[PDB]
Amino acid sequence: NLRAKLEEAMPIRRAAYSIIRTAMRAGAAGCEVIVAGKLRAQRARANKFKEGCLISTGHPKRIFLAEATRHIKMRQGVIGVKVRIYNPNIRGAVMPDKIEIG
Amino acid sequence: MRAKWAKKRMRKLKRKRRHMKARSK
Amino acid sequence: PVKRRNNGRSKYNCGHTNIVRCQNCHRCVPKDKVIKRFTIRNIVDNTIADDVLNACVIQGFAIPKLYNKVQYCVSCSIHNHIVRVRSREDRKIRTPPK
Amino acid sequence: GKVRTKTIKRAARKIVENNYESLKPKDFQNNKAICSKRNVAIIPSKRLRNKVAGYVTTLMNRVVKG
RNA sequence: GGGGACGGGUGAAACAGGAUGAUCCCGCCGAGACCGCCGGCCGCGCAGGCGCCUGCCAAGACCGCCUCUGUCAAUCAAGGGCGAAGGCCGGGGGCUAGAAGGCGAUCAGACACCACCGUAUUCCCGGCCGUAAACGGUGCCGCCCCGCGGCCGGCGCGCGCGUCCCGCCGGCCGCCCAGGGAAACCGGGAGGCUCCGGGCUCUGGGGGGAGUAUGGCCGCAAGGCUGAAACUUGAAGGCAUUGACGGAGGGGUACCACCAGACGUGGAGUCUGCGGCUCAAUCUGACUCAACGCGCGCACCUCACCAGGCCCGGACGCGCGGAGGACCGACAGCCGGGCGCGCUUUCGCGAUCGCGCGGGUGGUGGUGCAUGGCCGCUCCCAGCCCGUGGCGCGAGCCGUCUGCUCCAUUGCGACAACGAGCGAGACCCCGGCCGCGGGCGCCGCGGGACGGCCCGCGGCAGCGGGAGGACGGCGGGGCGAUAGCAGGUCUGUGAUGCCCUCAGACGCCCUGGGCCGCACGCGCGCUACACUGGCGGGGCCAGCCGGCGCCCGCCAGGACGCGCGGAGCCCCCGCCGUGGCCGGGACCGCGGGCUGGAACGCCCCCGCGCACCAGGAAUGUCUUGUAGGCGCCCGCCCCCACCGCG
């Protein structure tokens, strides 16, 4: 979805928050969008957009955090979009740190 | 000390100029 | 900005102070701005004091102390760690610490 | 040696705030049994549950003197 | 006078000094400066300034007062005097430092800093000069203005009474509530001011040009004081706040640091990579950590490079051509390593198409400094944020703390902060131990260990010790924040922008060669230098996880089979006996084999027995099943490990 809106010439931060909101609506604790490439300039900069908490370390990253890289070939060269969604709660395993406490 | 060094440079130009006016009186 | 009210010197009700020289640098420094730490030490090191004290054939003579006022220029003082560059908060402290 | 982390620490107080009589001053197994009562205190992993209990045992020991 | 070899100097030095005896020590002596330590949030002076001892002279502020006068006052162009240092003039003086000068070391060059010698000067008297960051960067006189201090000089009060105490006046000051200010800050003002008016003088009006030009005045001069314009320009500047740096101060921490030890390397031979060298080509990246057994085995392929030689496998689309004939094939001989490649020849062949134009597809081609992706590194670290409040006019800070604890931003404690998050940890993997269920094969799920307990020392987090227990205080790994960086890779890819080479090709194949060439210098290794060892036989033994039989062969291996099996070190006994020796196996002369299409690759066997007798300046890695020692397996592979991963 991000790859389509980027080839549709949408301002990148507008689209990135649109993808973030489509995972924010879905109940993900956070979503991290990284767009890297020659974004309008010869120099390459990576525009990281993030909303809500995401986790990056240990085994719960393999389970709770999903990731997706697409090599969208923009005209100037090739950009790379990486969408990552963090779903804290799934039907099976639960966070090995989160202590509920009654 | 660029201000003190500018004044000295100004002075060594004004003394030269004062000498040149004295040649023609 | 003005770093210190004192201006780095203790001059009060005066326009001129007697010049002194850094013991290390030899820079002329007005008496008010000099670091001025007085030291009273012992003529020989403590490590040699025991052996010298045993050596003396006199009945009760202690190793006689050496008194010198070391006066240092600002640069000589910061390089030789006599005084330290402090934060704007601790710069005000005046009591001798440690 | 082993320094308790904020999860292993805040939860221990929350357990001694809610429960007083159930845990005892030098009773790791009892402190591990109270902290293991399913929904009343839920700590995934015995390693975290054991560590919580040890800090509860230390906190319970502290409160009994004063 | 003494006594004896160097002394100075420095960051290290070097030029000077010293048997003409220096330095050093003492006894003296001359000269000229200088007034130490006491010496200050001391004091005095109009400022500049002021510090030996005595004597003298004139003054000065402060204070006290029921003394005198009676506004005699405040500030001030013009005008007068004073005015650090340096300088100048006419004399004196000449010790010390020391602008200039010269010099030794530097460094590319320093002529500079640093060392040495040194003239003016420094110092005195008589004049000049008239400048200083001449500062509190704050004119002067006057008023009210909030506490808490210190010092200073008078004066008075209390008290038995001491350099006590409380005040008063005057000076020097610190901290500061309001108040102010763009803040810094100031509050004995920079307060009482947009709510703007006590009095007097001075000065400024964006940055430069320029304190220049010119005229004047002044000076012996140097120069002072006064003082433009033409012209140029979008900022210059103030004070704060985040960062980024520092050749700054602290704290902290880590065997990629050290300590205490270990086992090393650097010294030899070789193995492999790197530079250079040499070439037809020696294809290339990578050059501190964070290039260099690195881009997981180069006879061929790989292979990108060289010497040659085929081949369209140029798609689609249009204009023309061609079917009795588009296009390519071919025997034999020549030529050519060889190929119907070409050539002689004369046969085939069947629109899969030719040609012109466009327009492709492919390229281990370039550019990683156009890029995606992925790794390295900072990071074998511990930071990174947010919501609400507090403080700021704000940028913002606080939280996230100069204390303690930790392995850790790991927690405690203090505290305008209070709670959360991410990273840390937890988690995941394997291991030791107990149980359960199963069992072609030990392999599935559950417990267990938590600084729990005990003794100290601690508010504390914890800091040592003691057991009990497979297991003890982060077991041996995976994962890895926020940011990054012109790290590395276009040569891993149907990842890619751009130049796209595009047919006598940089495509794609085949052969031959190189990538392994070697006056040399280096990195990772291996094998050594032996008697804690080599050499013979005798036991025995693993784990990652694991095939063998039989016959022929000294072997290496080969033939023919079947369904299956395992190290060295070490130990035990002989032997050699300090000899470069049976230590060491480098080089080289036969051979016998292997794997392949083909050795140049490897193995084996009989010679041949090099250096090296423990490694210089240096440099590495390491804390218990550890270092080291010893083998084994796999990775890649036709063959082959001195490598890597186990």
From TrEMBL, chain A:
Top-rank lineage group of the source organism: Eukaryota
Signal sequence region: none
Annotated family: Belongs to the universal ribosomal protein uS3 family.
Protein name as catalogued: 40S ribosomal protein S3
Organism this protein belongs to: Giardia intestinalis (strain ATCC 50803 / WB clone C6)
UniProtKB/TrEMBL annotation, chain B:
Keyword Chaperone: no
Lipid biosynthesis as UniProt keyword: no
GO biological process: translation
GO cellular component: ribonucleoprotein complex; ribosome
Keywords carried by this UniProt record: Ribonucleoprotein, Ribosomal protein
GO molecular function, one term: structural constituent of ribosome
Subunit structure: Component of the large ribosomal subunit.
Protein family: Belongs to the eukaryotic ribosomal protein eS32 family.
Descriptive protein name: 60S ribosomal protein L41
Residues of the full protein shown: 17 to 41 of 41
TrEMBL record, chain C:
Keywords of the record: Metal-binding, Ribonucleoprotein, Ribosomal protein, Zinc
Binding-site list for Zn(2+) 2: C22, N24
MF GO annotations: mRNA binding; structural constituent of ribosome
Family from the record: Belongs to the eukaryotic ribosomal protein eS26 family.
PANTHER family xref list: 40S RIBOSOMAL PROTEIN S26 (PTHR12538:SF0)
Protein name as it appears in the record: 40S ribosomal protein S26
Positions contributing to Zn(2+) 1 binding: C22
Species of origin: Giardia intestinalis (strain ATCC 50803 / WB clone C6) (Giardia lamblia)
Record has Metal-binding as a keyword: yes
A biological-process GO annotation: translation
Cystines in this chain: C22-C25, C22-C76, C25-C73, C25-C76, C73-C76
A GO cellular-component term linked to this record: cytosolic small ribosomal subunit
Coiled-coil ranges from the UniProt annotation: none
Highest taxon above the source species: Eukaryota
UniProtKB/TrEMBL annotation, chain D:
First and last residue of the signal peptide: none
Residue spans crossing the bilayer: none
Top-rank lineage group of the source organism: Eukaryota
Record-stated family: Belongs to the eukaryotic ribosomal protein eS17 family.
Protein name in the entry: Ribosomal protein S17
UniProt source species: Giardia intestinalis (strain ATCC 50803 / WB clone C6)
Lineage: Eukaryota, Metamonada, Diplomonadida, Hexamitidae, Giardiinae
Section covered of the full-length record: 2 to 67 of 137
